[PDB]
Amino acid sequence: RVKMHVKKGDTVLVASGKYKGRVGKVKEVLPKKYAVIVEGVNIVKKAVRVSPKYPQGGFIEKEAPLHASKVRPICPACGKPTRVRKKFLENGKKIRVCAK
């Protein structure tokens, strides 16, 4: 419902800021918040776990979302806007001059 966008569970390059030019997989997409995942932004948010059953939270943490426009999908080369193709029976998406 107009919510839908650009990339999904697959390989992408960053063109952002801090992590410019990177390549990482599946973005575990939101999208209520318009973001992604990659293997990119990491920060250590200081912890003690949700309940210190299986005690403390550790000190390297997880990936940050990252704004969904900073990523750019890729195939036999680099980025390319996605285009769309009929198949003559179903529907899928071809990169501009290549495939998928």
Added chain:
Amino acid sequence: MEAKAIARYVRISPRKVRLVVDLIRGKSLEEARNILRYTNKRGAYFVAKVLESAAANAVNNHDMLEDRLYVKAAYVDEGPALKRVLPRARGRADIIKKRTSHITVILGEKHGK
């Protein structure tokens, strides 16, 4: 080097607490404790509390050395009041303001060379 304290939002009127802060301004840490010990005021308790946390900080955090310490300066500034209603005769209703304070203490080390 100096150590700093600051106790915010304490719930007592400035004009009243100042009275005792002005007592210890510029004195050895040792005397201050006794001045407050035997000064006979609600504000004692409050200022004592802030005088100690300051000196802990000097020793512990800036390795300054208990014996050399004194009150370099101190002051108490005003915070935002608590407004409350007081009914009167012929049902007239005044507003009473419960005043409030931010208490500050800073220690230094006497002499050097």
Added chain:
Amino acid sequence: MKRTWQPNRRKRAKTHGFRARMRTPGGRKVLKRRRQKGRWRLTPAVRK
């Protein structure tokens, strides 16, 4: 001294109630005004 408000629940319902207001054309208009205003109570809040 004894004052003006002397609550009695029978009295209130018979006087300012719903069924009461709908009997009289004037009472009918009260609601109609109230509803168009978006009041959350058309009649005084009365129960147990």
Added chain:
Amino acid sequence: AKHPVPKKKTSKARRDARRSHHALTPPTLVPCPECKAMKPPHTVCPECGYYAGRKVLEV
């Protein structure tokens, strides 16, 4: 609210001038003999005490 009332706002200067005498006094103290402490004179005090008299603890 009634009869007599101030004619003018009292000026900052004359406010503070009233208060010249509001200054405080430090409590008067002597060293607790028969123990290292300060205490106000003519007082029993509980780091110490007296002799032919009562005080804190002894075990």
Added chain:
RNA sequence: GGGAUGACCCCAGGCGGUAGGGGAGCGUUCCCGAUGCCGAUGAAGGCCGACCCGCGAGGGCGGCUGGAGGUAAGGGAAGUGCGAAUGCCGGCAUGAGUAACGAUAAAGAGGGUGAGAAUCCCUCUCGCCGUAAGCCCAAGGGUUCCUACGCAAUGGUCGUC
């Protein structure tokens, strides 16, 4: 008066001012100029100056603050300039550590508990009500009843209640 009208040089007069009449300007918001020009090497706004230009309203210049906007030359519209209205809204002052703390039935001590107790719990003294200041129903009130954890606020002080 020069008169190469130069709006610049020379000469001579006028210039106290309420109600009012007339003439010039300065600044605020918005529009064309704009698919432009300035801008993170710092926009608007804020704080300072003994400097520069204007008779003046104003405009420049410099230093600190601020962090994303601003908008010439020449013109066009108007919710366009506040000190007063026992003006309106909000904020903070004075009186002031001043009057008060709501029946003149009345208190004292010892033990607990607690970071902290005149103000909580227990005990022993003392005082006050007793066609009540005791008990039982009706109205009205709407969980205030009981219990465990609490004390920022509410309690006219304190508070572990």
Added chain:
RNA sequence: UGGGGCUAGGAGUGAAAAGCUAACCGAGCCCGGAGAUAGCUGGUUCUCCCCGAAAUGACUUUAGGGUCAGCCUCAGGCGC
């Protein structure tokens, strides 16, 4: 004296004061007509330049309000 009822705004009620009718009744309260009207009182916001009054007469259900005249100002014309 408790509970249940009835009467209202030029209307009720009143052993009669113009009393009472939801803490101000010689005519209740609310909303509307409505931004009533107010010859009365108050207030009216940046700068410089030139000129600069009146508090009289006539009439006025007029007399602290007006209309004409008089006295201030600007523009055009006339020229001792």
Added chain:
RNA sequence: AGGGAAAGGUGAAAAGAACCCCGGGAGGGGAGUGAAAUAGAGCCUGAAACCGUGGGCUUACAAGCAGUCACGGCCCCAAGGGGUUGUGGCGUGCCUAUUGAAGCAUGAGCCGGCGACUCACGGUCGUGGGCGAGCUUAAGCCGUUGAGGCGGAGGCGUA
């Protein structure tokens, strides 16, 4: 019946401050995140009244609409300025209303923000233009989608 408020904003991202230290807590002080933490949570910018601390000049034989003019001393970058004020000269608040007000006549505690000569249609002078014995269109119709054309019924003027 009816009346009727106040109250918006961290940061690009919560990375919203683990752990230690004083404190019953609330607060703070280290540490750490961030470009920035007087961006730390009724947190952008943070003006004024109002309340503090520190520093220079200054005051206890004076007398005043609180200022100005002149000397003189001290304190801070240099033949000149800035700050402060000892002595001497001179000086009846602002506004309104009034024949006349410092007036013992009205209003105002102080600061900030809101706050009062407008618009439509007629009319009448003045003025910058167009066309002229003539000048001008209204409703509407056609286009534009920030484009303009057409439309003489009518109106004023020529006695």
